[PDB]
Amino acid sequence: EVEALEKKVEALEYKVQKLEKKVEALEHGWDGR
Amino acid sequence: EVEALEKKVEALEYKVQKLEKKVEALEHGWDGR
Amino acid sequence: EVEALEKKVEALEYKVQKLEKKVEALEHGWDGR
After folding, report:
1. Under a CB-based contact definition with an 8 Å cutoff, are residues C14 and A12 in contact?
2. Which chain C residues are Cβ-neighbours of B3 within 8 angstroms?
3. How far apart are the first and last CA of chain C?
4. What count of other Cβ atoms lies within 10 Å of the Cβ of residue A5?
5. Mind giving me the DSSP string for C1-33?
6. Which of A18, C9, C25 is nearest to B12 (CA)?
7. Which distant-in-sequence residues (6+ apart) come within 8 Å of B3 by Cβ?
8. How far apart (Å, rounded) are the C-alpha atoms in residues A30 and A18?
9. H-state helical runs in B1-33
C-alpha cells in the first residue's frame, strides 16, 4: 500500500510542477501569452 | 494513517486531472479562450 | 515512510489549492485577466 502511494505521489509531484510552470507562464504572459 | 493518505491522494488525483484539462484549454485557446 | 508521504501530500494539497485559485481567476477573467 505504501509503495502504491509513493508512486502516485511522485507522479502527482511531477504533474503539479508542470502545472505550476504552465500557470506561471499564463499569469506572467510569457512568450506571447 | 494509510487510509487517510489514500483518500487525500485520490482527491488530489481528481483535482490535478481537472486542472490539467483546464490549463490545456487555456494554453490551446479552446472554445473561445 | 508514512511521515515522508504525509508531508509530501500536505505540500501537494497547498500547491493544488493555489493552482485552483489561479486557474479560476484566469478562467473567470478576474481582476483584468
Report:
1. no
2. none
3. 42
4. 19
5. -HHHHHHHHHHHHHHHHHHHHHHHHHHHTGGG-
6. C9
7. none
8. 15
9. 2-28
Sole residue written with cell 478562467? C27
Q: Nearest 10 degrees: CA dihedral of C8, C10, C16, C21? A: -150
Give exposure, B1-33, as e/b (b: 16+ Cβ within 10 Å): eeeebeebbeebeebbeebeebbeebeeeeeee
Q: State the chains in contact with A (3 or more Cβ–Cβ pairs under 8 Å).
A: B, C
Positive or negative CA dihedral for A28, B33, B14, A3? Answer: negative
Shortest CB distance from A23 goes to which of B5, B6, B23? B23
CA atoms within 13 A on the CB side of A15: 21
Residue C19 CB neighbours (<10 A):
20
What number of other Cβ atoms are within 10 A of residue A12's Cβ? 20
Q: What is the resolution of this structure in A?
A: 1.8
Measured between beta carbons, the chain A residues lying within 8 angstroms of C23 are 23
The method recorded for this entry reads X-ray
